[PDB]
Amino acid sequence: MTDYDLAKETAAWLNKQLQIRPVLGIVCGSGLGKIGDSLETSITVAYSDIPNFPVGSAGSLIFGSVNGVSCVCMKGRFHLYEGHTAARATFPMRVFKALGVKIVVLTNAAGGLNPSYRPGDFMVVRDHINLPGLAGANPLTGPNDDTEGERFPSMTSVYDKTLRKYAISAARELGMSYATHEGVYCCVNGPSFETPAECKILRLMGSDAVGMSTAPETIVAKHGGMRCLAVSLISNVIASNCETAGEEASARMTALVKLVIEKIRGELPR
Amino acid sequence: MTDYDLAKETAAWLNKQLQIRPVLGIVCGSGLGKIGDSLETSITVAYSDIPNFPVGAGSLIFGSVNGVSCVCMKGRFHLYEGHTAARATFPMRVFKALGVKIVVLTNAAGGLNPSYRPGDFMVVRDHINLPGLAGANPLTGPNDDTEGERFPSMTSVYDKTLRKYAISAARELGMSYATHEGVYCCVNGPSFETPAECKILRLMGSDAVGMSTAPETIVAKHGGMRCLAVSLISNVIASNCEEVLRAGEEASARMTALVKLVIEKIRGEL
Amino acid sequence: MTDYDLAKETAAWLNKQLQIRPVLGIVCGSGLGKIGDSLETSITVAYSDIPNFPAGSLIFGSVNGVSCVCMKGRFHLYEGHTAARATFPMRVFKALGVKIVVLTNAAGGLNPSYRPGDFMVVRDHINLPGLAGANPLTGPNDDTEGERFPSMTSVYDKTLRKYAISAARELGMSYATHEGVYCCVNGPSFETPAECKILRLMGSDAVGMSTAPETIVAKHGGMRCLAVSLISNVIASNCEAGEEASARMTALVKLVIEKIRGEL
């Protein structure tokens, strides 16, 4: 029984409790849980009761609609730094696929490296640099089911160009155009923050922000045929020398995702 | 019982079926299996029947080429399938235990160098093994001080002489314009890199990128064997960093010819 | 039972045999064991008899009036231990009440002006394994033992560094003593020339296979760190004895511990 087989199982079990299968998925990053209250006529399933879900250390999965679209929302995610393997922490993404999800919207809190970023800003992700996945902790490592996806999937366009446009225009429409950027997300293992010398390397690599998640999730989602959009809340910013609110962030992010979902109801079921 | 001890056992078991111990080894990369048909008076042993060999279709071929007794791997093992670096490089330890002195490796890789074209050959002069720098080194673990150094030098992994033979053999076969000499960058896989990651790989000086070979030559070199590796540039990445059979079969024939001529030049030094 | 819990246990077991809890810790790198002979009225505990620990020995004793615990031998990721496992002794040091840790190692110099025999006081590090799947803090975190997301902005105490530099001057080694960036790799194979180039591009002055994960953990555990590398060899521009080193290093550490005792 492979991961995808287990994912199907998990899906089938969740399906028992659903009237409409989710077509849009959402993953809530650090402190961005409130986004979930946005789901209407929602059923909630604690991660602890979900079969095969990685042991937590109280996350929950929410099913409901937003602007007429059936969604599944993850309130809390899993990270490599907690001890999970890349495959393990990205198990929910395989489950999203097995549930029929076609678009996934992810959010996270990250450290800004780009000189023009300010704490509170939003960085729409246009590409990523996944360090762990280049060296021994790639979430697709292992046997591949040739009917679920490619053995060697392309990561040339992990972040859907169209979903990005919707995100940037939704930001403008909401009046946050000056605090909303588009850049490169660099994912590291964590949980210790980087030394100034490491931070310099990260800037040398062209990173606009750095965090400890998301990239492995979108590698798996993209491989699973799903479209991805990710937005980072720049929670803090690193000075030029390379060294180093929540409620407002939450509200703004929630509005942005909702508006994005609205524009998305043109490109998917119901 | 250490890996080297298991390698010796595996070798002793293969030896039972051999008249002449192989002195030269060959590892066939993706789509380069045909190279094996080049062995004369050959005995074939499926990987599945070989003791201690990882499972993955693959076979080990013993036979001669241009008067040289060789052992040829038709298929190899990669980190992305789920094997540890040590596990995927177990066949190299076996090669050593068999008495192999020279190993010729081939692989299919993506060209990053602006002047490479699909179909070209890149003789490997050096490598960049990302997984081995960060937590997935094939020598990680206890070291048999009688099998090799604890801290083996990797200053000359790719034998300068074997390279000359390869370059010259290419010229001699009329492929000098399609044959290069460059740096091979090894990554975990199985997902291809993002454009932002590809940029980093270029910034590191990579001429081509693939998901194998490097950990195998690290182990081979450590085991006192001499290495030669040739990459078939199956595809090329554009400057922005982003049927099929027609190409594969010609590549196979060219590569087979190159390897044979190289083995002939080698027969002058054993 | 978490690592921190096991560390406390191991500590409690060591403390049974101690009159004074160590306040300063020392980790001896490759060939730098002699530093341990510097401890007076010393109790010695082989690593093999220590509970939970992975011919290494732990030495308890005083130096210049300071009670210390000294590790004669360390653990490395290349031996097969996980980053957490190899950094277990650091958690033990914390549980023993250690406040300052002095680390030493042998390393390869990349900086053009370094020479074999020189000393490189560490001002910062580049921990490759820890950025990609082998971080020593990976796993659950005891919020009472340290931060979940600890800052690594100042791993190497600026003050301890000053003590080190001046102790070097005072000992007449100012010309062979530098201050630079230590790059930690997994090992055990040395890097290819092409990899060495990357390492220089990253701003590394020296490269070794230890220390960084240990200071990540010590720092997280609220301890102050000082690390000094013995530049055992140097890499040429193209990117390709021990007893004197031992004596010099031993003197430098002792003088630094003396300056530490007079602090506050």
Coordinates of C-alpha atoms in Angstrom, one line a residue, chain A:
Chain A
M1 CA 0.0 0.0 0.0
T2 CA 1.7 3.2 -1.2
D3 CA 1.2 6.7 0.0
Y4 CA -1.2 7.4 -2.8
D5 CA -3.2 4.3 -1.9
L6 CA -3.3 5.5 1.7
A7 CA -4.3 8.9 0.5
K8 CA -7.2 7.4 -1.4
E9 CA -8.3 5.5 1.7
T10 CA -8.1 8.7 3.8
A11 CA -10.1 10.5 1.2
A12 CA -12.7 7.7 1.0
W13 CA -13.1 8.0 4.7
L14 CA -13.6 11.8 4.7
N15 CA -15.9 11.4 1.7
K16 CA -18.4 9.5 3.8
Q17 CA -19.2 12.8 5.6
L18 CA -19.5 15.0 2.5
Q19 CA -22.4 16.0 0.3
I20 CA -20.2 17.8 -2.3
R21 CA -16.5 16.9 -2.9
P22 CA -14.2 19.9 -2.5
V23 CA -12.9 21.4 -5.6
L24 CA -10.7 24.1 -4.1
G25 CA -8.2 23.5 -1.2
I26 CA -6.7 25.9 1.3
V27 CA -3.7 25.5 3.6
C28 CA -3.5 28.0 6.5
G29 CA 0.0 29.0 7.6
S30 CA 1.1 30.3 10.9
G31 CA -1.5 32.5 12.6
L32 CA -3.6 32.4 9.5
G33 CA -6.2 30.1 10.9
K34 CA -9.1 32.6 10.9
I35 CA -9.3 32.1 7.1
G36 CA -11.2 28.9 7.9
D37 CA -14.1 30.6 9.6
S38 CA -14.8 31.9 6.1
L39 CA -16.3 28.5 5.1
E40 CA -20.1 28.3 5.2
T41 CA -22.2 25.2 6.2
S42 CA -19.0 23.7 7.4
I43 CA -18.2 20.3 8.8
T44 CA -15.0 20.0 10.9
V45 CA -12.8 17.0 11.3
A46 CA -9.9 17.2 13.8
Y47 CA -6.6 16.0 12.3
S48 CA -6.3 13.5 15.2
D49 CA -9.4 11.6 14.0
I50 CA -8.3 11.4 10.4
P51 CA -6.8 8.1 9.4
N52 CA -3.2 8.2 8.2
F53 CA -2.8 11.9 9.0
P54 CA 0.7 12.6 10.4
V55 CA 0.7 12.6 14.2
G56 CA 0.3 16.2 15.4
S57 CA 1.8 17.8 18.5
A58 CA -4.9 21.0 17.5
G59 CA -5.1 21.0 13.7
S60 CA -8.4 20.5 11.9
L61 CA -9.7 20.1 8.4
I62 CA -12.8 22.2 7.4
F63 CA -15.2 21.4 4.6
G64 CA -17.6 24.1 3.4
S65 CA -18.3 26.7 0.7
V66 CA -17.0 30.2 0.0
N67 CA -18.4 32.4 -2.7
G68 CA -20.3 29.4 -4.0
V69 CA -17.3 27.0 -4.2
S70 CA -16.9 23.9 -2.2
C71 CA -13.6 24.0 -0.3
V72 CA -11.5 22.0 2.0
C73 CA -9.4 24.0 4.4
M74 CA -6.4 22.9 6.4
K75 CA -6.1 24.8 9.7
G76 CA -2.5 24.0 10.4
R77 CA 0.0 22.1 8.3
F78 CA 3.0 19.8 8.8
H79 CA 6.7 20.8 8.6
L80 CA 10.0 18.9 8.1
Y81 CA 11.3 20.6 11.3
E82 CA 8.7 18.7 13.4
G83 CA 10.3 15.4 12.5
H84 CA 8.2 14.4 9.5
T85 CA 9.7 13.2 6.3
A86 CA 9.1 15.3 3.3
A87 CA 6.6 12.7 2.0
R88 CA 4.9 12.5 5.4
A89 CA 4.4 16.2 5.8
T90 CA 3.0 16.4 2.3
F91 CA 0.6 13.6 2.8
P92 CA -2.4 16.0 3.1
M93 CA -1.6 17.3 -0.4
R94 CA -2.0 13.8 -1.8
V95 CA -5.2 13.6 0.2
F96 CA -6.4 16.9 -1.4
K97 CA -5.8 15.3 -4.8
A98 CA -7.7 12.1 -3.9
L99 CA -10.6 14.3 -2.8
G100 CA -10.8 15.8 -6.2
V101 CA -9.3 19.2 -5.4
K102 CA -8.2 21.1 -8.5
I103 CA -6.8 24.3 -7.1
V104 CA -4.8 24.8 -3.9
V105 CA -4.3 28.1 -2.1
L106 CA -1.5 28.1 0.4
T107 CA -0.4 30.7 2.9
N108 CA 2.5 31.0 5.3
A109 CA 4.3 33.5 7.5
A110 CA 7.9 34.2 6.2
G111 CA 10.9 36.4 6.8
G112 CA 11.5 39.0 4.1
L113 CA 14.9 39.4 2.6
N114 CA 13.9 41.7 -0.2
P115 CA 14.9 45.3 0.7
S116 CA 11.5 46.8 -0.1
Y117 CA 9.4 44.4 1.9
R118 CA 8.0 45.5 5.3
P119 CA 6.5 43.6 8.1
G120 CA 2.8 43.1 7.3
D121 CA 3.3 42.9 3.6
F122 CA 2.1 40.1 1.4
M123 CA 4.4 38.3 -1.1
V124 CA 2.6 36.3 -3.8
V125 CA 4.8 33.5 -4.7
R126 CA 6.0 33.3 -8.3
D127 CA 8.7 30.6 -7.8
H128 CA 10.6 28.8 -5.1
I129 CA 14.0 27.4 -4.0
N130 CA 13.6 24.2 -2.1
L131 CA 16.9 23.4 -0.4
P132 CA 15.8 20.3 1.4
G133 CA 14.4 18.8 -1.8
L134 CA 17.6 19.3 -3.7
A135 CA 19.6 17.4 -1.1
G136 CA 18.0 14.3 0.5
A137 CA 14.5 15.4 1.6
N138 CA 12.4 15.6 -1.5
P139 CA 8.7 14.9 -0.9
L140 CA 8.4 12.7 -4.0
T141 CA 11.3 10.5 -3.0
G142 CA 10.3 6.9 -3.2
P143 CA 8.3 4.7 -5.6
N144 CA 6.0 6.6 -8.1
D145 CA 2.6 5.5 -9.2
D146 CA 2.8 6.1 -13.0
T147 CA -1.0 6.7 -13.1
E148 CA -1.0 9.3 -10.4
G149 CA 1.8 11.4 -11.9
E150 CA 5.1 11.7 -13.7
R151 CA 8.1 10.0 -12.3
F152 CA 10.1 13.1 -13.1
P153 CA 7.6 15.9 -12.9
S154 CA 8.4 19.4 -14.3
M155 CA 8.6 22.2 -11.8
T156 CA 9.0 24.9 -14.4
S157 CA 5.7 26.5 -13.5
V158 CA 4.7 25.4 -10.0
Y159 CA 2.9 28.7 -9.4
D160 CA 0.0 29.2 -11.8
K161 CA 0.5 32.4 -13.7
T162 CA -3.2 33.1 -13.9
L163 CA -3.9 32.4 -10.2
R164 CA -1.1 34.9 -9.5
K165 CA -2.8 37.6 -11.7
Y166 CA -6.0 37.0 -9.8
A167 CA -4.1 37.4 -6.5
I168 CA -2.3 40.6 -7.5
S169 CA -5.5 42.3 -8.9
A170 CA -7.5 41.1 -5.9
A171 CA -4.9 42.9 -3.7
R172 CA -5.1 46.0 -5.8
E173 CA -8.9 45.8 -5.7
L174 CA -8.7 45.6 -1.8
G175 CA -6.4 48.5 -1.6
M176 CA -3.2 46.6 -0.7
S177 CA -1.3 47.0 -3.9
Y178 CA 1.6 48.9 -2.2
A179 CA 2.0 46.2 0.4
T180 CA 1.7 43.3 -1.9
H181 CA 4.6 41.9 -3.9
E182 CA 5.4 39.0 -6.2
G183 CA 8.7 37.1 -5.5
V184 CA 10.7 34.0 -4.9
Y185 CA 10.1 31.9 -1.8
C186 CA 13.1 30.0 -0.3
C187 CA 12.3 27.0 1.7
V188 CA 14.8 25.7 4.4
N189 CA 14.5 22.9 6.9
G190 CA 14.3 24.9 10.1
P191 CA 13.6 25.2 12.9
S192 CA 16.6 27.3 13.8
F193 CA 16.7 30.6 11.9
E194 CA 19.7 31.2 9.6
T195 CA 23.0 32.7 10.6
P196 CA 23.8 36.0 8.9
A197 CA 26.4 34.2 6.8
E198 CA 23.6 31.8 5.7
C199 CA 21.2 34.6 5.1
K200 CA 23.8 36.1 2.7
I201 CA 23.9 32.9 0.8
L202 CA 20.1 32.9 0.5
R203 CA 20.2 36.5 -0.9
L204 CA 22.9 35.4 -3.3
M205 CA 20.5 32.7 -4.5
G206 CA 17.9 35.3 -5.3
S207 CA 15.5 34.7 -2.4
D208 CA 12.9 37.4 -1.6
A209 CA 11.6 35.7 1.5
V210 CA 12.5 32.6 3.5
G211 CA 10.3 30.1 5.4
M212 CA 10.1 26.5 6.5
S213 CA 7.2 25.1 4.4
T214 CA 5.1 25.4 1.3
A215 CA 7.6 24.4 -1.4
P216 CA 7.4 20.7 -0.7
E217 CA 3.6 20.9 -0.6
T218 CA 3.4 22.6 -4.0
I219 CA 5.9 20.2 -5.5
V220 CA 3.4 17.4 -4.5
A221 CA 0.3 19.3 -5.5
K222 CA 1.7 20.2 -8.9
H223 CA 2.8 16.6 -9.4
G224 CA -0.8 15.6 -8.6
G225 CA -2.1 17.8 -11.4
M226 CA -3.3 20.6 -9.1
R227 CA -2.9 24.3 -9.7
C228 CA -1.1 26.3 -7.0
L229 CA -1.2 29.7 -5.5
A230 CA 0.8 30.6 -2.4
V231 CA 0.9 33.9 -0.5
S232 CA 3.4 34.7 2.2
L233 CA 2.7 37.1 5.0
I234 CA 6.0 38.9 5.6
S235 CA 5.9 38.7 9.4
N236 CA 9.4 40.2 9.8
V237 CA 12.2 41.6 7.7
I238 CA 15.9 41.0 7.7
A239 CA 18.1 44.1 7.6
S240 CA 20.7 44.7 4.9
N241 CA 23.4 43.2 7.2
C242 CA 21.4 40.0 7.2
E243 CA 20.2 39.8 10.8
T244 CA 16.9 40.1 12.5
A245 CA -0.1 42.9 14.1
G246 CA -1.2 39.2 13.6
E247 CA -4.9 40.0 13.8
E248 CA -4.7 42.7 11.0
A249 CA -2.6 40.3 9.0
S250 CA -5.2 37.6 9.5
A251 CA -8.1 39.9 8.4
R252 CA -6.3 41.1 5.2
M253 CA -5.2 37.7 4.2
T254 CA -8.7 36.3 4.7
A255 CA -10.2 39.0 2.5
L256 CA -7.6 38.4 -0.2
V257 CA -8.2 34.7 -0.3
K258 CA -12.0 35.2 -0.4
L259 CA -11.7 37.7 -3.3
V260 CA -9.3 35.3 -5.1
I261 CA -11.8 32.4 -4.6
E262 CA -14.5 34.7 -6.1
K263 CA -12.5 35.3 -9.3
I264 CA -11.7 31.6 -9.4
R265 CA -15.4 30.5 -9.6
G266 CA -15.1 31.2 -13.3
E267 CA -12.4 28.5 -13.7
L268 CA -14.0 25.5 -11.9
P269 CA -17.2 23.5 -10.9
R270 CA -20.1 25.4 -9.4

